[PDB]
Amino acid sequence: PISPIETVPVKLKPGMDGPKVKQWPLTEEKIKALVEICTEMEKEGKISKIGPENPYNTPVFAIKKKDSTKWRKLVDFRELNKRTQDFWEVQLGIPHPAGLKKKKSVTVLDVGDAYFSVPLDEDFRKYTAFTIPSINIRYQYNVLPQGWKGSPAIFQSSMTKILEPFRKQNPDIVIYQYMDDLYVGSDLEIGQHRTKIEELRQHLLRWGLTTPDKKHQKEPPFLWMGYELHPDKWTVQPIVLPEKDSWTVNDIQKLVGKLNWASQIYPGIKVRQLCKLLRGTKALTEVIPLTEEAELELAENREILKEPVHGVYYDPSKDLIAEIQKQGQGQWTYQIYQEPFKNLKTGKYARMRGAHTNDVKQLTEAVQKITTESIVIWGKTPKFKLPIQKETWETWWTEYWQATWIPEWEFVNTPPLVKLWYQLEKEPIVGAETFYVDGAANRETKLGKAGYVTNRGRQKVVTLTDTTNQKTELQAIYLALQDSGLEVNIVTDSQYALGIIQAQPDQSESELVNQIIEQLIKKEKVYLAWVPAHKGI
Amino acid sequence: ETVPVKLKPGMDGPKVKQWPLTEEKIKALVEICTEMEKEGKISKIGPENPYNTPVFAIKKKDSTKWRKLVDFRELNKRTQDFGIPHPAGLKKKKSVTVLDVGDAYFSVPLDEDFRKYTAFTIPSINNETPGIRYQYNVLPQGWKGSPAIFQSSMTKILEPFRKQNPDIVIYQYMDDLYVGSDLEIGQHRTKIEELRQHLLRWGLTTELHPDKWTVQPIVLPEKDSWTVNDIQKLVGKLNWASQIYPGIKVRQLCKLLRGTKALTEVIPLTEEAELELAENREILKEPVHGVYYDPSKDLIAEIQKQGQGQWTYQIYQEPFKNLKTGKYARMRGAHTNDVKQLTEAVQKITTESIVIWGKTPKFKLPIQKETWETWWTEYWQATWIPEWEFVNTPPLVKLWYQLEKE
Ligand SMILES: Cc1occc1C(=S)Nc1ccc(Cl)c(/C=N/OC(C)(C)C)c1
């Protein structure tokens, strides 16, 4: 049924005009069908016939369905959609299951053909013009057309107004619209709930919006993007993996994809060896021999994915707790819960080392990421239980060059704790040897020398083929570190070394830097000093 | 009657995404907005309007009442320009007082066709509810066109206090009014309260010290005996510093540094080196000659984390030709939060720029974007929002300004 609701004013992009595309010649049968089908909605007032005063046109084709072999129609608004103005974001994001509260009962009213219930802006209607051909019939839409850019947007806002009165009258009921489905939950006794639903149903019906009967509508458990929603709890569908004989590259990719999604809820899942099977793949359909290391892994994963996972919903009267763990270098797992072991959400992050970082800086980034998603879901930030001592944090952040912070948190002694691998001395070490290191390389020929000379008379130099200046400089520093004992003073003029002094990184992209890092850690005390170049020093 | 405002030719309205807000402030905004809607200041809008500007709520200093703040930076940048006067008086005043006259704007209607462009959205926790879309019908606070259009009325409103007190300076920069006088605190505070009443009377409602802000000299360390390391450190600084003061020389000291000696080795200064140093101390006793502010060029502010709660900054237009520089110690209370201190500092510095040049500086912040975006709003307490970018502090620039006097 059509409805008596205010149409939303819709216009085409600046300086653009309606569609004017060719109508495909169909069959005597397809034409027959569309003639019948169109005459149907024609009688319903959904569409109206138009004459030659309309120069626009959108292609219309026929398609047989799944349940009836009976024909349905399809209008290709691709072009029109290009020429239509933009509306504000349809849905600014989906509600995550961990941000929902428990409800005694939840029912979803499929307001299916509601797009065709909301009236289209009269003026715009002309652009919807289409044609039913003959072997050897013009119409236009008077209502929101399935497929048109503005339909979902306009339909949503319409549904929003229509529900405002019912919502006010019933502030103890929760409605959530998504597409053409209306989810409604509450904490009322089943009988009372059943009643309100009907009241709502009749409220929408008052606006021509037809809805399915109690006999016919949907019920829980619901499927919500990987989750299986229950009024009491949410559940993750035990992810099924296909055990097969012949594996193709493509197949491995898809597999690694599903596995990666899984790891968020199932820490332990590994794909390191499975990823290796991709190295040098010449075609997407080339078959790959599954290495036994990959067989043991793929197996160990099926076991993990055996045990399902069901969590709990959010209780506003309880505090939020977020706990974090470092599974490896640049790998962190976290779980947010209100009552211990009764998880709301879990996740993990892998951090591609990048230029140069340190574990504490990384922890900081996790905390930051978590804090952001928390605010989106619960509107508040968790109290943090972090595997790091208050002493360590204080020492690091108070000196680090960049502004950084971690909200109210508390140390949790869950090994392995993140700690400062090393700390450069603040002043020169008395007694220790002093290495004046230097390195230079011919930029063009990539030929260089790296070396040092100490206050104890020691010296060394090395010639390097296929090297760069930065490498040479660092190499100079590497050598000094290798040949020095537990305590060392090192002076360099390297601009890049200035970075290490300031950031004191414990991981980097450069394997060379990493070599230096390992060496710095091995030292008992290291004092690094910088001096301008081409001077006396 | 409304004045027709336009976007600069060719531009389109802002379509900036709203940042997630905490429950606490979403509620606060809902409340504030329902009320403003009743009063007819704003109106609900549909999807047919595609523009958007971020909003949020902050709590003023000494006021435990939430205040709605919008981010019009993008709109302002696209808003046409339009006699906008700035005096060099309050720069010299003994005391200045900032006044929030943002409320005034809500009385004045905003041109119908420009209204669409002021669309904003209140979000919902966990996206369980669609955003509540509104748009202004009156002049928006924090917008650049507002103080502009409200100019006339403003001048009239103030003229009486002006003519009866030409010994006082009043400067309007957006939502604020800077009132400065040399009159001792008694008369100043009392005269301010009087001015308030003067405004209150018309409907709308609402200490700093300019000549105490000095650019500090770079003091060099002094020891009884210098070590190879001390000299190296000193030389490094001077060498870099010569980019500002070309009269700085380092050769004589550099000479003492020739030879692979132990860093802890004590070295006596040659009389030639002693002079060179004494000469440098002299050049550093004053800021570089030749630095004149250019109104047609952007003002820039660089901040460096100094640790222990300290922060250093330099306002300039051309690198090394600093118009002003300074040191900032963390406010009592922020003993554990960097974002807190940084924002406070950002605000303090912006204020000064306003007082002096009546222009906000573009900030170069030593922080990761993510960290800033996530917590800046939590401590912001100004009607305006300056421009910023995130950078990596060069170690050298840091060691230098660490040397400022006290
Ligand atoms: C926002 C909401 O709409 C309808 C129910 C609810 C809430 S707060 N709780 C809740 C409790 C149990 C289930 Cl099964 C669902 C179903 N949610 O489905 C969506 C996410 C589509 C609302 C929702």
Short mmCIF file of C-alpha atoms and ligand atoms in Angstrom, two decimals, chain A residues 100-101 103 106 174 176 183 185 222 224 229-231 313, chain B residues 128, ligand 1:
data_model
loop_
_atom_site.label_atom_id
_atom_site.label_comp_id
_atom_site.label_asym_id
_atom_site.label_seq_id
_atom_site.Cartn_x
_atom_site.Cartn_y
_atom_site.Cartn_z
CA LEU A 100 24.60 -4.77 22.87
CA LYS A 101 22.69 -5.27 26.14
CA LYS A 103 17.00 -8.44 26.08
CA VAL A 106 13.87 -9.89 20.26
CA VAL A 174 14.37 -0.98 21.50
CA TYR A 176 16.94 -0.97 15.32
CA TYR A 183 14.77 -5.46 15.01
CA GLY A 185 13.85 -6.13 21.70
CA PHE A 222 20.20 -14.30 14.59
CA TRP A 224 25.15 -10.90 12.72
CA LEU A 229 22.99 -13.66 18.44
CA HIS A 230 20.86 -14.92 21.34
CA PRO A 231 18.80 -12.78 23.75
CA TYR A 313 26.56 -8.72 26.44
CA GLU B 128 22.41 1.42 17.47
C1 LIG C 1 20.01 -2.49 19.72
C2 LIG C 1 19.07 -3.68 19.88
O1 LIG C 1 18.07 -3.80 18.90
C3 LIG C 1 17.34 -4.94 19.23
C4 LIG C 1 17.82 -5.52 20.34
C5 LIG C 1 18.98 -4.67 20.78
C6 LIG C 1 19.88 -4.81 22.00
S1 LIG C 1 20.55 -3.48 22.77
N1 LIG C 1 20.17 -6.07 22.50
C7 LIG C 1 20.13 -7.29 21.79
C8 LIG C 1 20.12 -8.48 22.53
C9 LIG C 1 20.02 -9.69 21.89
C10 LIG C 1 19.94 -9.75 20.50
CL1 LIG C 1 19.72 -11.25 19.76
C11 LIG C 1 19.96 -8.57 19.76
C12 LIG C 1 19.88 -8.60 18.30
N2 LIG C 1 20.57 -7.59 17.62
O2 LIG C 1 20.56 -7.53 16.46
C13 LIG C 1 20.95 -6.27 15.98
C14 LIG C 1 22.40 -6.06 16.22
C15 LIG C 1 20.66 -6.23 14.53
C16 LIG C 1 20.18 -5.19 16.66
C17 LIG C 1 20.06 -7.35 20.40
#
